[PDB]
Design an enzyme around this catalytic site. Structure first.
Site, PDB file in Angstrom:
ATOM      1  CG  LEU A  14      37.747  -1.427  47.698  1.00 30.84           C
ATOM      2  CD1 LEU A  14      37.689  -0.016  47.700  1.00 30.84           C
ATOM      3  CD2 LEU A  14      38.933  -1.697  46.732  1.00 30.84           C
ATOM      4  N   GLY A  15      37.186  -4.168  51.458  1.00 32.90           N
ATOM      5  CA  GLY A  15      36.994  -4.491  52.744  1.00 32.90           C
ATOM      6  C   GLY A  15      35.706  -5.010  53.454  1.00 32.90           C
ATOM      7  CD  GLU A  16      33.606  -9.493  52.901  1.00 29.27           C
ATOM      8  OE1 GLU A  16      32.884 -10.437  53.717  1.00 29.27           O
ATOM      9  OE2 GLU A  16      33.988  -9.781  51.919  1.00 29.27           O
ATOM     10  N   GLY A  17      33.476  -6.383  57.172  1.00 34.12           N
ATOM     11  CA  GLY A  17      33.173  -6.189  58.615  1.00 34.12           C
ATOM     12  C   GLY A  17      31.730  -5.950  58.953  1.00 34.12           C
ATOM     13  N   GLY A  18      29.343  -4.430  57.331  1.00 32.67           N
ATOM     14  CA  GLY A  18      28.961  -4.804  55.909  1.00 32.67           C
ATOM     15  C   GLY A  18      30.240  -4.803  55.033  1.00 32.67           C
ATOM     16  CD  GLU A  19      29.662  -6.123  50.209  1.00 30.04           C
ATOM     17  OE1 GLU A  19      30.895  -6.490  49.352  1.00 30.04           O
ATOM     18  OE2 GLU A  19      28.422  -6.517  49.981  1.00 30.04           O
ATOM     19  CG  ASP A 120      39.414   1.539  66.160  1.00 36.05           C
ATOM     20  OD1 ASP A 120      40.276   1.139  66.620  1.00 36.05           O
ATOM     21  OD2 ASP A 120      38.731   0.813  65.265  1.00 36.05           O
TER      22      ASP A 120
END
Ligand SMILES: N#Cc1cnc(NC(=O)Nc2cc3ccccc3cn2)cn1
Length: 270
Positions: A14-17, A18-19, A120
């Site tokens: 669904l997303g990353e940056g 872990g995951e 954020d």
């Protein structure tokens, strides 16, 4: 007692940056988001997530540790990020942005009421469920700014430069709540214009100087109607002590302007 209910299949990223993986329960087919952190940073995110319970804040279901890996079981929002509802250089219809801004205020009022600052807020961190209900997500940079009814001033520089309040770049210490109010104003600007007003809020930034000199004939301001623009004039105020507070955002004229119809409900004629 039911066998296999604790089994979740990871079916997509669904997303990353872990995951972040989409997890589907083997028995019930319930969908949740599993945040996989390959490790104090995640310990604080878990401790803040356990305090959260609100319809406009991503739900926390629990956490599991497999040695070095932390698994965070979080609410699945099938609508994705608010970011992908913003059309570049256009934005979105003003009633949709008003509804998303109402829901963002409810979530932020909630967080500030229990003494949490997100730090954020940006469209990448605002998720949408199947009914387009906004959910504040990712408490990785969040902190407690009020404990035992005593406010603590912040000094840590964090967030994302186009959304950060100017006091974070100018002052050693600052109040937590006006910083989240500022970032909500940049989100509102993005939703109504499909563009960010400046790289960062500093005098060295020409677009930021132009705003303080009220050059609203320039982009992104020229694309925004005068009623939501009068609200942005109150939010994007350099001095955080003079910046509008959320109770006063709730009394704003555009904020209270009837614009959007409820969700389309099935109907027949004759
Ligand atoms: N931190 C965090 C976090 C990240 N995602 C969460 N839940 C989701 O359902 N995320 C999600 C869902 C998506 C659904 C469609 C497209 C992109 C998407 C991106 N992210 C919950 N918490």
């Amino acid at each position: 007692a039911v066998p296999f209910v604790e089994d979740w299949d990871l079916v997509q990223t669904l997303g990353e940056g872990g995951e972040v993986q989409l997890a589907v329960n083997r028995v019930t087919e319930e969908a949740v988001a599993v945040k996989i952190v390959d490790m104090e940073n995640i310990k604080k995110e878990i401790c803040i997530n356990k305090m959260l319970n609100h319809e406009n804040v991503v739900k926390f279901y629990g956490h599991r540790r497999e040695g070095n890996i932390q698994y965070l079981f979080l609410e699945y929002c099938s609508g994705g990020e608010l970011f992908d509802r913003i059309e570049p250089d256009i934005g979105m219809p003003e009633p949709d942005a008003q509804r998303f801004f109402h829901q963002l205020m409810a979530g932020v009022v909630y967080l500030h009421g229990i003494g949490i600052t997100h730090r954020d807020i940006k469209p990448e961190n605002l998720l949408l469920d199947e009914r387009d209900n906004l959910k504040i997500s990712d408490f990785g940079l969040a902190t407690v700014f009020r404990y035992n009814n005593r406010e603590r001033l912040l000094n840590k520089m964090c967030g994302t430069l186009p959304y950060v309040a100017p006091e974070l770049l100018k002052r050693r210490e600052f109040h937590a709540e006006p910083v989240d109010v500022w970032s909500c104003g940049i989100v509102l600007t993005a939703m109504l214009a499909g563009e960010l007003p400046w790289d960062q809020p500093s005098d060295s930034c020409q677009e930021y100087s132009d705003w303080k000199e009220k050059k609203t004939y320039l982009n992104p301001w020229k694309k925004i109607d005068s009623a939501p623009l009068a609200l942005l004039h109150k939010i994007l105020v350099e001095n955080p002590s003079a910046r509008i507070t959320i109770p006063d955002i709730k009394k704003d004229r555009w904020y209270n302007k009837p614009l959007k119809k409820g969700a389309k409900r099935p109907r027949v004629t004759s």
